[PDB]
């Protein structure tokens, strides 16, 4: 099981600086080129750079982008990956993936890791409310969903029951207004299940560190 | 510098059907030391990270179905998809590592399917949002194609535009429908000053709207 995990995202003021970690595991990590890739929501991949490995001594490149202003480093005791920004502008703001590269002879980027979000902003680090959506009709099915509302920045993720619910589930895109962020997420259910069973939405906001469950009880 | 460029932006295809979408090198990227062409095919899915389809133009990656296809050589390079299926809606992107690494722009793949009518919910304010002074009225339009569609709110039989924020979602990986959300925001005390809650949905698939509504009490 190839992993990559990358950490270090969050909010950060324009003009500021930033570090974000790529661990790895599940190969020989001094054999890989490593690279970093960024992408702003809704928009495309941009290639940043990348860290050759042992064979090619551990050297850098960088895109034209960036090149001067950001920088890699690799902990090869650790098998870990850095990428080091400086003079942040809201250009930055993106989901950064780093993936496997050149390992000598494959031209690929065989493994990608999950992305860690960056939001360059002024505006301050709000944790969500949460609200109930409950019904109530009489269907076969029913429609139950949770309000996450005045955030920020991104992300925030939505399960229901723990995961336990994973099929008729629409968490939708966050809109923003006045520098929060509101999204909802919905569920659908067998009219039989509930409120017999319960339903339960659980709402993580790391950038704050909230984590709430809400039930959804009939009104 | 070496530009990468695709075409088309987006498009829409039937299950069953074929794609193919083209890559553009601003330069040839046939390594002449080794005879391949260094242009690789990721697909990124709607909240997924990108994963590897193809490489050095042609050599589907291990997992991958027969359906994709990587084909071209020097400057010109396809994707094509033989017969495509509910789950290939996803953005692909081709990119050069033959002077470091560049990606295109991508290709977004949008699935065609059967006009299909939403299914409308509405939701009144929770008693905890209430308390605290704000009044959210929630309407879900689910698993409707196609995307385009109307939300209209009345408060007491009369329509209301202030306040009302919309979100549809990606295409469904498995039925290709999408979703919206209709979010209507009052204060507490507007919320008071009325008795009647409407979400209407219009969409090409009934002449007759679709309507949800709830009263405060
Ligand atoms: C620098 C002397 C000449 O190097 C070559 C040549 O370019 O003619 C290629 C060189 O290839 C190998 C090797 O040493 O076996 C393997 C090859 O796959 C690469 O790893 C290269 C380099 O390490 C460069 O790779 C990169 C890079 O680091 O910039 C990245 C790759 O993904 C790709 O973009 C290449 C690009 O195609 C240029 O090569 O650049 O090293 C080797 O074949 C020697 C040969 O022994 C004669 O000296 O020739
Ligand atoms: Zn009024």
């Known amino acids: 099981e190839v992993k990559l995990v990358e950490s270090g995202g969050g909010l950060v003021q324009p003009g500021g600086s930033l570090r974000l970690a790529c661990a790895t595991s599940g190969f020989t990590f001094t054999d890989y080129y490593m690279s970093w890739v960024r992408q702003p929501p809704g928009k495309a991949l941009e290639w940043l750079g990348f860290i050759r490995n042992k064979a090619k001594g551990y050297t850098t490149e960088y895109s034209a982008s960036v090149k001067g202003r950001f920088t890699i480093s690799r902990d090869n005791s650790q098998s870990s990956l850095y990428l080091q920004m400086n003079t942040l502008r809201a250009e930055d703001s993106a989901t950064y993936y780093c993936?496997?590269?050149?390992?000598?002879?494959?031209?690929?980027?065989?493994?990608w890791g999950q992305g860690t979000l960056v939001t360059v902003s002024a505006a301050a680090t709000t944790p969500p409310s949460v609200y109930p959506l409950a019904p109530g009709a009489t269907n076969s099915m029913v429609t139950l969903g949770c309000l996450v509302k005045g955030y920020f920045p991104e992300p925030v993720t939505v399960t229901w029951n723990s995961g336990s619910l994973s099929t008729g589930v629409h968490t939708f895109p966050a809109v923003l207004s006045s520098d929060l962020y509101t999204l909802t997420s919905s569920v659908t259910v067998p009219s039989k299940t509930w409120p017999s069973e319960t339903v339960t939405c659980n709402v993580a906001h790391p950038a704050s560190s909230t984590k709430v469950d809400k039930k959804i009880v009939p009104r | 510098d070496i530009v990468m460029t695709q075409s088309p932006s987006s498009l829409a295809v039937s299950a069953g059907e074929k794609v193919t979408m083209n890559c553009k090198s601003s330069?040839?990227?046939?390594?002449?030391?080794?005879?391949?062409?260094?242009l690789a095919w990721y697909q990124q899915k709607p909240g997924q990270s990108p994963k590897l389809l193809i490489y050095?133009?042609?050599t589907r990656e291990s997992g991958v179905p027969d359906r994709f296809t990587g084909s071209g050589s020097g400057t010109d390079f396809a994707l094509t998809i033989s017969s495509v299926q509910a789950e290939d809606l996803a953005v692909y992107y081709c990119?050069?590592?033959?002077?470091?690494?560049?990606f295109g722009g991508g290709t977004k793949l949008e699935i065609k399917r059967a006009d299909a009518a939403p299914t409308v919910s509405i939701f009144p304010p929770s008693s905890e949002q209430l308390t605290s002074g704000g009044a959210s009225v929630v309407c879900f339009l689910n698993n409707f194609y196609p995307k385009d569609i109307n939300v209209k709110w009345k408060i007491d039989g009369s329509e209301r535009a202030n306040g009302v924020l919309n979100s549809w979602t990606d295409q469904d990986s498995k039925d290709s429908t999408y979703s919206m959300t209709s979010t209507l925001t009052l204060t507490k005390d507007e919320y008071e000053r009325h008795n009647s809650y409407t979400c209407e949905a219009s969409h090409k698939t009934s002449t007759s709207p679709i309507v949800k509504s709830f009263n405060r009490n």
């Open positions: 993936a496997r590269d050149h390992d000598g002879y494959y031209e690929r980027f065989a493994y």
């Open positions: 330069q040839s990227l046939l390594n002449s030391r080794t005879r391949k062409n260094y």
């Open positions: 990119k050069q590592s033959y002077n470091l690494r560049t």
């Open positions: 050095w133009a042609s």
